[PDB]
Structure to design on (824 residues):
C-alpha cells in the first residue's frame, strides 16, 4: 500500500500527463483476500507506465548510458582530447582560476572530438573501507541529475560514480606520463640499453592492468543492461538489481585496500624521476629496477592476501586475475 | 510435478548426476581424466584450484 | 591533436597508398567529391585523425606523393577518387622526374630539390599544433623508392626530433634476378637507415604475397593488381583504435610503445585471416571469438618468409591480437584463457611476455558489422632468417664482381659496403643474445 502511493507520488514529479490514470477506478473487490492483489496490480500499473514514459520521451536509457560513459571512460577518443588537455594544466597545484579554464578547455575538446549530440553531451561540469584521496588533484566530473531521474540514479549514487572516475584517472595519468617517457627517450649518459628494458617493462605492465580494469567493469555492464530490460515489471526490483550493477562497480574497485593504493602510487613517483633522468643528460637505473622488484614482490603479497579472503565468488574472480598478472 | 518440468527440470537432474558422479557416459570423464593426469601426478598446492576449473571447462 | 602525415613515395608506395585513401571513404560513409550519407558522424565518432580537418565537410587527405616515374600518377587523375586529392598540396598537372633507375639518382636528387622538398610538405605540419609524427609509405623494391627514401630518414630526424617515425615498407621479391639485379644493393642501403635513422618498421614480404595470393584467392597469372588488396586492408586495420573510438592504445605512439623491446629490434610480423567472401553465408549463426585467435599464432596467415624448424630456439616477446567490429566481449577473456594451455608462443626465459588483445567498433556497413576480423602484430625472433637471406645474397654478389664498377662513378668514393654488413650482423647477433 505504502510503496504504491510512493509510486503514485513520483508520477506527480514529472507532471500531470499521467495523473488520474484511465483504468483502476473501474473495479473493486471486498470479500477475501483479492483486494490485497488490487494493491499489487496498483503497485505495478502506475509504476510501469512511468517507466515507459521516461524510456520514451525523457530518455532514461540514454541518460544512464551517458553517466556510465563519463565516469568509466568507455569512449577514450574523447579523452586523448580531454585528459591530454587537462594534464597540461593540472601539473602544478591549482590557485583559484584553473577549474574555470579547465571547463573552457573541456567544451573545446568535446566538439573537436565531435561527440554524438553536443548540446546533449555537454552535461559535464568539472568538480575540483574508509578511503581518502591519494592523488594530487580532486579532478572529477558532475552530471546534471534532474528529478524524477533522481530515483533511478541517486545523488548518493553520483558520489559513488565520482569516486569511481577518480580511481580510473589516477592510473590513466601514469600512462600519459609513460607515453611521455617513450617520446622523450626517442632521439641517457651511459645506460641506454638498461633504460630501454625498464621502459618496456613498466609501460607494458600498466598497459596490461588498465586495459583489464576498464574491461572487467564492461563485461558485467552489458550483462546487467540485458537483465535490466528482460525482467522489468515493477520499478522496485529493477532498481535493486540495477544497484547490483553498482555492487559490480564495488567488486571491481573496492577490493583494492589502502595498502594497495600506496603500492600503485609508487609507480607514479618513479616515473617522474625517470623522466627527469632522460632530460638531464646508472646508479639511479639500478635504483629504479630495485623499485620495480619491490613492486613485484608487493604484488605477490597482495596475491597471498587475496587467497586468504572470504572465499566467495568475488574472491575467485580477484584471485584468478592476479594469478593472471603473475603469469605475466 | 508439472511446475518442475516447466521451470527447473528436477528429475532431469536425477539422470544428469549419474553422468558425472556415477559416470554414466564415459566420454565426459575420459577426456577429463586424460587432461587431468599431468596435474594429479604432482602434489597439490595453493595454486591447484585455478587450473582445475580451466581444465574442467576445456574438457566439457 | 593526433594528426599523422603519410609520406607516400616510390613506384610501389604510391599505389598501395592510393587505395588506402580509397578504402577510407567506403568506411567513413563519405564520397571523394561530396557528402551524400549521414552515416559519417552518427556511426563514426572520429574522422579528423588521418584526413585534414574540414572546411566545407571535405576531409582532405594529409598525403604527399613524389616519384620519379610519371606512370603511377597518370593512372590516378582519370579515376574518380582523384578529385579528393588536391592539385596544389603536392604537384600540379604534368609532374615528372628523372630518367631513371638508380639508388644514387634519388640519393643525389634530394639535395638539388632541397629547397622545394622542404617547402610544401611543411605547410601541413603547422596545421595542428601537436603533430603525431611521420609514416614513410615508401618502397624497398627498385631504385625510385629506395634512393630518395633514405634521404628523408636523415634530415627529418633532427628537424623534427620529437615526432614518431614508423613505416609500412614493402619488401622486394627474390624469385629470379633477371629484370632487376641491383636488388641486394639498394635494399641493404635503406635497411641501415631503417634501424638507426628510424625507430620502427612494418615488414611486408613479396614472396609471402603470392603464397597467400594463390592460397584462397585462386589466380593463375600473378599480376600487380592484387598487391593493393592485402595491403590496404591491414593499413586501415592498424588504425582502428586510432580512427574509430577506442580507449587504450588509441594512438600510434600507443601501439608501437607496447611491442618494441629495444631499438634495432622493431621488425613486426603481420597476420590477417579473413579474406574470403563466401564465408559470409555462415557467419549468421553467431560465429564466436573463441576460434579466431587459435589460428593467428598458427603460422598460416603470416606475411614473413621464415623457417619452419627455427621456432623452437626462438621466443615470442610481444604479440598483438586485434579483434574488430562484433566481438561479443563476454567471451574475449575466454579466448585469452585458452592461450596459456597450448603455449603456442614460446616465451622468453629472461623476462615476461604479453598477449595484448583490443577491440573497436567497425564501420556501419554490412560486410563490416557481420564478419569477425583478426589483425595480428607479432614480434618473433626468427626474423633474422630474412636477414640471413639478404646477407647471403649480398656477399655472394660482391665476389662475382657485380656492380662495383657500374655503381661508384656517381657520388660514391669510398667502400660503404661493409658499413652495411657489420650493422646488419649487429642486429642478427643482438637478437639471439636477447634471450639469455
Amino acid at each position: 500500500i505504502l510503496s504504491t502511493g510512493k509510486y503514485l507520488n513520483v508520477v506527480r514529479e514529472c507532471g500531470h500527463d499521467v495523473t488520474c490514470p484511465d483504468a483502476k477506478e473501474i473495479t473493486y473487490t471486498l470479500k477475501e483476500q483479492a483486494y490485497v492483489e488490487r494493491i499489487e496490480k496498483a503497485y505495478n500499473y502506475a509504476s510501469k507506465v512511468l517507466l515507459d514514459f521516461l524510456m520514451e520521451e525523457e530518455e532514461l536509457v540514454a541518460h544512464l548510458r551517458s553517466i556510465k560513459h563519463y565516469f568509466l571512460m568507455d569512449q577514450g577518443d574523447f579523452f586523448v582530447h580531454f585528459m591530454d588537455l587537462t594534464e597540461e594544466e593540472l601539473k602544478k597545484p591549482v590557485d583559484d582560476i584553473i577549474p574555470t579554464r579547465l571547463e573552457a578547455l573541456l567544451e573545446l575538446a568535446l566538439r573537436m572530438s565531435t561527440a554524438n549530440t553536443d548540446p546533449f553531451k555537454d552535461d559535464l561540469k568539472i568538480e575540483l573501507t574508509e578511503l581518502a584521496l591519494s592523488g594530487l588533484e580532486s579532478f572529477s566530473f558532475d552530471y546534471i541529475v534532474k528529478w524524477p531521474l533522481s530515483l533511478i540514479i541517486n545523488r548518493k549514487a553520483l558520489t559513488r560514480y565520482q569516486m569511481l572516475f577518480r580511481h580510473m584517472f589516477y592510473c590513466k595519468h601514469v600512462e600519459r606520463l609513460l607515453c611521455n617517457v617513450w617520446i622523450s627517450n626517442k632521439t641517457s649518459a651511459k645506460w641506454f640499453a638498461g633504460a630501454f628494458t625498464l621502459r618496456q617493462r613498466m609501460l607494458n605492465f600498466v598497459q596490461n592492468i588498465q586495459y583489464y580494469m576498464m574491461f572487467e567493469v564492461m563485461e558485467p555492464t552489458w550483462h546487467i543492461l540485458e537483465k535490466n530490460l528482460k525482467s522489468a515489471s515493477n520499478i522496485d526490483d529493477v532498481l535493486s538489481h540495477h544497484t547490483s550493477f553498482l555492487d559490480n562497480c564495488l567488486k571491481d574497485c573496492m577490493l583494492t585496500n589502502p595498502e594497495l593504493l600506496k603500492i600503485f602510487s609508487k609507480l607514479m613517483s618513479v616515473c617522474v624521476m625517470f623522466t627527469n633522468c632522460l632530460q638531464r643528460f646508472e646508479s639511479t637505473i639500478n635504483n629504479f629496477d630495485s623499485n620495480f622488484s619491490a613492486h613485484l614482490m608487493d604484488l605477490l603479497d597482495k596475491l597471498s592476501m587475496y587467497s586468504t579472503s572470504d572465499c566467495e565468488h568475488s574472491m575467485i574472480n580477484i584471485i584468478y586475475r592476479l594469478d593472471f598478472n603473475g603469469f605475466y | 510435478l508439472d511446475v518442475l518440468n516447466k521451470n527447473y527440470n528436477l528429475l532431469e537432474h536425477m539422470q544428469a548426476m549419474r553422468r558425472y558422479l556415477l559416470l554414466g557416459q564415459g566420454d565426459f570423464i575420459r577426456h577429463l581424466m586424460d587432461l587431468l593426469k599431468p596435474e594429479l601426478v604432482r602434489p597439490a598446492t595453493t595454486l591447484y584450484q585455478h587450473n582445475l576449473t580451466g581444465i574442467l571447462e576445456t574438457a566439457v | 591533436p593526433r594528426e599523422i602525415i603519410t609520406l607516400q613515395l616510390g613506384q610501389c608506395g604510391n599505389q598501395i597508398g592510393f587505395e588506402f585513401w580509397k578504402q577510407l571513404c567506403a568506411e567513413h560513409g563519405i564520397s571523394p567529391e561530396g557528402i551524400v550519407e549521414e552515416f559519417a558522424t552518427e556511426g563514426t565518432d572520429r574522422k579528423d585523425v588521418f584526413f585534414y580537418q574540414a572546411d566545407d565537410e571535405h576531409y582532405i587527405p594529409r598525403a604527399v606523393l613524389l616519384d620519379l616515374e610519371p606512370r603511377v600518377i597518370h593512372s590516378i587523375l582519370n579515376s574518380p577518387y582523384a578529385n579528393l586529392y588536391n592539385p596544389e598540396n603536392i604537384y600540379l598537372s604534368e609532374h615528372g622526374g628523372g630518367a631513371g633507375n638508380n639508388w644514387a639518382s634519388g640519393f643525389s636528387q634530394g639535395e638539388k630539390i632541397h629547397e622545394d622538398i622542404f617547402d610544401i610538405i611543411d605547410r601541413e605540419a603547422d596545421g595542428s599544433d601537436s603533430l603525431e609524427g611521420f609514416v614513410l609509405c615508401h618502397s624497398i623494391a627498385g631504385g625510385t623508392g629506395s634512393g630518395l627514401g633514405s634521404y628523408l630518414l636523415e634530415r627529418l630526424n633532427d628537424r623534427y626530433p620529437k615526432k614518431l617515425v614508423q613505416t609500412y615498407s614493402v619488401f622486394p621479391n627474390q624469385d629470379e634476378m633477371s629484370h632487376v639485379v641491383v636488388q641486394p644493393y639498394n635494399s641493404l642501403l635503406t635497411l641501415k637507415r631503417l634501424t638507426q635513422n628510424a625507430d620502427c618498421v612494418v615488414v611486408l614480404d613479396n614472396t609471402a604475397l603470392n603464397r597467400i595470393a594463390t592460397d584462397r584467392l585462386h589466380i593463375q597469372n600473378p599480376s600487380f593488381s592484387q598487391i593493393n588488396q592485402l595491403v590496404s586492408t591491414i593499413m586501415s586495420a592498424s588504425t582502428t583504435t586510432l580512427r574509430y573510438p577506442g580507449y587504450m592504445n588509441n594512438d600510434l605512439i600507443g601501439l608501437i610503445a607496447s611491442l618494441i623491446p629495444t631499438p634495432r629490434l622493431h621488425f613486426l610480423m603481420t597476420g590477417y585471416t579473413p579474406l574470403t567472401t563466401d564465408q559470409s553465408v555462415a557467419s549468421v549463426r553467431k560465429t564466436t571469438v573463441l576460434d579466431v585467435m587459435r589460428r593467428l599464432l598458427q603460422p598460416k596467415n603470416v606475411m614473413v618468409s621464415t623457417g619452419r624448424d627455427r621456432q623452437t630456439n626462438h621466443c615470442y616477446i610481444a604479440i598483438l591480437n586485434i579483434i574488430q567490429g562484433e566481438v561479443d566481449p563476454t567471451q574475449v577473456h575466454k579466448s585469452l584463457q585458452r592461450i596459456r594451455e597450448r603455449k603456442l608462443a614460446n616465451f622468453i626465459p629472461w623476462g615476461p611476455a604479453s598477449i595484448q588483445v583490443a577491440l573497436s567498433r567497425k564501420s556501419p556497413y554490412l560486410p563490416s558489422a557481420h564478419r569477425v576480423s583478426g589483425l595480428m602484430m607479432a614480434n618473433h625472433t626468427n626474423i633474422s632468417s630474412l636477414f640471413e637471406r639478404t646477407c647471403r645474397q649480398y656477399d655472394k654478389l660482391r665476389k662475382r664482381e657485380a656492380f662495383l664498377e657500374q655503381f661508384r662513378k656517381e657520388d660514391i668514393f669510398k667502400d660503404n659496403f661493409d658499413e652495411l654488413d657489420n650493422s646488419r650482423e649487429i642486429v642478427q647477433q643482438l637478437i639471439d643474445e636477447y634471450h639469455a
Chain A touches chain B at residues 307, 319-320, 323 (CB under 8 Å). Chain A is about 65% helix and 0% strand.
